[PDB]
Design a protein around this nucleic acid. Sequence first.
RNA 1: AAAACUUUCAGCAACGGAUCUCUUGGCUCUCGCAUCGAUGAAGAACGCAGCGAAAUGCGAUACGUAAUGUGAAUUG
RNA 2: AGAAGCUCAGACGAGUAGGCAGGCGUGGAGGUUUGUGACGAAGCCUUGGGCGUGAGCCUGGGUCGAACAGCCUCUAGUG
RNA 3: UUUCAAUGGCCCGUCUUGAAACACGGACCAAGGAGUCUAGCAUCUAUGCGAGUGUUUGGGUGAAAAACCCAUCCGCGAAAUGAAAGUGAAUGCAGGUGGGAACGCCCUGGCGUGCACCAUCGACCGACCCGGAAGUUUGUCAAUGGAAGGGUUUGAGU
RNA 4: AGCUAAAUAUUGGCGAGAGACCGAUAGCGAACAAGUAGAGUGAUCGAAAGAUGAAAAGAACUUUGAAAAGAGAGUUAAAUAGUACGUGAAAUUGCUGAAAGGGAAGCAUUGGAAAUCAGUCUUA
Lengths: 186, 48, 51, 125, 123, 147, 52, 52
Amino acid sequence: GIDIERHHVKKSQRSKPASENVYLKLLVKLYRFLARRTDSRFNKAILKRLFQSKTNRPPISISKIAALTSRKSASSQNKTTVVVGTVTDDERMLTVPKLSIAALRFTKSARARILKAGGEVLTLDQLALRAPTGSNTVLVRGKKHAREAYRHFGFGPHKHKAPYVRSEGRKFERARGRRKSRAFKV
Amino acid sequence: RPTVSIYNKDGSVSSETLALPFVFKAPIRPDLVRSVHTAVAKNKRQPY
Amino acid sequence: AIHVKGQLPNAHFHKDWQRYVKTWFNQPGRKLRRRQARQTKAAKIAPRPVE
Amino acid sequence: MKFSRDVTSSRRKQRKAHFGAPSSVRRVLMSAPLSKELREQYKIRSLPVRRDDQITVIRGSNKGREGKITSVYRKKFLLLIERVTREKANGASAPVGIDASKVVITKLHLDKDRKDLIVRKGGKV
Amino acid sequence: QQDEVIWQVVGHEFCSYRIKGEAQNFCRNEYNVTGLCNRQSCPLANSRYATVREDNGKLYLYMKTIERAHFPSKLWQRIKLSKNYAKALEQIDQQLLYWPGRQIHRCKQRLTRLTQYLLKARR
Amino acid sequence: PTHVSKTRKLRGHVSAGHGRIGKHRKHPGGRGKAGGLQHLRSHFDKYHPGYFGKVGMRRFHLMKNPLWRPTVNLDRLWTLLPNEARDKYLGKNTEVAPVINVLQSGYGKVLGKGRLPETPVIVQTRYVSRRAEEKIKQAGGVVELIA
Amino acid sequence: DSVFGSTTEVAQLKKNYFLPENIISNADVTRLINSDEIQSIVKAAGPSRVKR
Amino acid sequence: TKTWRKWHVKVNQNEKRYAIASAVAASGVPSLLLARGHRIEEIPEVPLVVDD
RNA sequence: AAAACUUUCAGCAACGGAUCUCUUGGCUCUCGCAUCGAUGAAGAACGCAGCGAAAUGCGAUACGUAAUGUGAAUUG
RNA sequence: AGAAGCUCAGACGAGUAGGCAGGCGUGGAGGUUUGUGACGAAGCCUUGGGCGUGAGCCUGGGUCGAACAGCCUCUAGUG
RNA sequence: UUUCAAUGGCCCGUCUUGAAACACGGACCAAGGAGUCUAGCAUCUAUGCGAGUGUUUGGGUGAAAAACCCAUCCGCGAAAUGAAAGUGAAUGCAGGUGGGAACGCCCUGGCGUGCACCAUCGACCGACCCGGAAGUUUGUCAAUGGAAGGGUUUGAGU
RNA sequence: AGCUAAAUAUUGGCGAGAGACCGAUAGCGAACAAGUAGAGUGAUCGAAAGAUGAAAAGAACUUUGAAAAGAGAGUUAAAUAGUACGUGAAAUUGCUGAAAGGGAAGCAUUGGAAAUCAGUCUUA
């Protein structure tokens, strides 16, 4: 026998989407070829993010794309923005700048606002033709840890995390262990 | 967008034609139809 | 017992509830019955408005 | 397909109705077609069978046999036809029952009630 | 829509020309050349393709186009051969030289075996 | 579906996934939340602090209807208007300023989170926070309090 | 057209309903891959089935 | 077995409309029809539109 | 160390009634309806057929009478 | 080149309680197969033959007498 | 397939530190026979929309318990915080620092740029501990009011 | 002090329609002569049990026996459907054939012996 620490250490990766979307399978086929046949580390990233699940691909918004593309020091203003995921709308921004965004999905409000403001909406396959190697592209992500679950993950003594309460209120987990007047505060 | 011919009672082609509706450009999703059909076909079951 | 993540359970199911369960399989049958009565009333009271 | 809500499409209920039908219903259940001559003469597609009718066997082992209806055995849904017998082992003769739909009527037993039946069912006598 | 999505929908799993077994599936497509389920060989899934079948001692060859794909009745064209097996092989690669040549070997095999089918029928 | 369940994969394994030593018994720990101060105290005081005891004063016949006061922020005030109104009034100097009645939109207070464009606008509202009204005033608008 | 609408205008018979938009614009990956844009930049085509 | 099992399952209306639109689009594609099983090898045109 | 006996296998015959197919039955849901009794109800007893013990029907007018409909049976 | 495919290379292989994955078999439902069948369906017996690591499947012979199955999916009183 | 020879091979299931056990259950065979359903909750996955979302309580419609369509509510989310009265989230490019995905540039590295994420320093909102400026009217001296500023404490916040 | 329809409920009764239900150890306890037969003083308890065939054509006749039956014959598409009736499994049993057996048997590996069988070739 052999003295081996760990046996058949499977990697924590996904080799294909769990989605059955035929169009997503087509995009996977195109970007699998692009990643395999080019040295574009961008294409490898897009292939990885196509495999990812919904919770690992959070939404991004028009305003957040505008904020990330209009920084002072950065000159990434005209570069095409790339999101592997949806691009939701932000109605809090009354005037939308001109943006060229390529993403899996656009909400109807976001797509209408972009095209009205003068920009353009692309799909991942269309960006595979404009910038096949991902040159002059700003690859961005949504705030993954903005889900409700991460309010609760890591709950414990003195962790300042949200509890699982059936009803937020005064008679609902506020007395013993939540204030120094009732025994102790945790 | 392309057009489609209208066929008479005898199967001949009429002069008039109709533009192809946009619904025939919509995405074709076998998985979505399967999941929706799976659910909808359950909506006429009788209890036992 | 209680050892899993999530809310503390609150299921008010300590009475004999299975005797008083109410199903809604007559929901379309009730809907059709109301319309026929509604159409009967409209035909009975015509020409004056139904409501 | 049926569209009436008062008619049963259940195989169970239809079979119970057929086999629990009283004598007055088995009278209409046991109907036989008319021959070409009677059909073109009376304008009637088919009529219920009756005793003393002159009919011809159409199907079965006794195909082509001729005889009068000696007795409509309603409770067993069988027609007993004269000269249509079978020889038992001991030599006795047992009449053989023939289904009503497997015969054809070639001469009716015209009564006034039968004449009224013919003229009522869109026919001519 | 497009040829790729057509294959993704049909082909792969469910088709009226699919015959699955233990772990292998046959393509009974009357337009397939090799009888294998593939993008290369399913004219339902892909654009213009060829195929051949037999009738009463002679053979006929099916062909396709692109612009007429919306007219099922006149989409597909038939050409008929009743002369010889060698001539039939000549006709096939002649009608595929100006065409994607990947199907010449598979087609000529189909012609030559169907002719052997005819000879064995006679014997 | 039962044909993709785990009871279909334990057919043949004796204990059915529950062990041979400890076994699957009815209620080895009690029924429900019973024991949260004696033997479930480790779970309760670690994952549900505050569960036991009283806090605060006790109110009889509480009705949420007279306490109904949903809130809106400043940056959502312009979104409360129709698009035609926005295109008519944003960025263009007009002698008449738009009226945004937040009560119709279903709010009982205007809060001060966010910024406003440089166009005067009338805000008709039941309540308003201190700096929300200050921002509106400095933006050229006014707050008219309704009943 | 009135029953289903288009992908940019409301269907008349389904209030506030727009036809769905696809996550891929061109669904013909073979021609998309074999187009000049992709084949003019991909590195040299490595060998197929390899000798042992 | 009890009658208060869940016999009917709820589906979002928008997803139902998505599935209707997909099913109508598929009906316009001749290749899917032949796969589905319909003998349309000599149908004059797909989609087949006939006079009023 | 032959037969018998014991065991295994096969054919055939038993014992037994599993399997398969069926189903005038049950179960469940839905729809429509409101109608017991001192003018003697529900239930019980005992009787009634050419040949009957049960089931079904009936009450000394007793497997029923009157009346209406159908139109030639019943049947061992 | 059923790209869910093909191809090259290296390392490794114990397992109770337990976990997970992919498959096998049973009853019913939608679709499908120009599907099987009184010229013998299903079931049953078999010192016959073949396939799979296995769950299991196929087939010859006999018996029998009216129905039954493959593939894609749905479901459960499923071993 | 049967049988012989040589070699090996204890009776399974079970609780148990340990069962071939002089521990339990089991004579045999056929059919039946044990993680189901529902109200919830939590992670993970898939789908549709997305600052929204949810047709199905009802209405319309359909000759038909299906499907299809629709009004006004409402549930959850878009704001927290306090026991409450109540107040209620931009000094800044919605902020600095470190690591960073992807891209650009330069001659393996270097420079610029920094998504997501965590370490971290500050700002804002509320509670708490101070602090009492306007204003309000009503007692002006007072009553009411609570801005500036101070904590480096607190929240399931921005 | 009092009356009052509709919208509401409906494991009973009466009458209809169905069903992703059960398919004779299942589904009601009861598919059948079932709340029956049977048990208990009583209150009560409570089964088992469906299928010849298209049609009884339910086996005339002869022969052996006291008889039940048997053997012939006859009926049938079929008695390998004869009422002890569709199909007719396993436990268990008798007969026949084959082989083994000195105080267990069964099992695994490897080959001999006997029995049995297919591929393969034959052709191109």
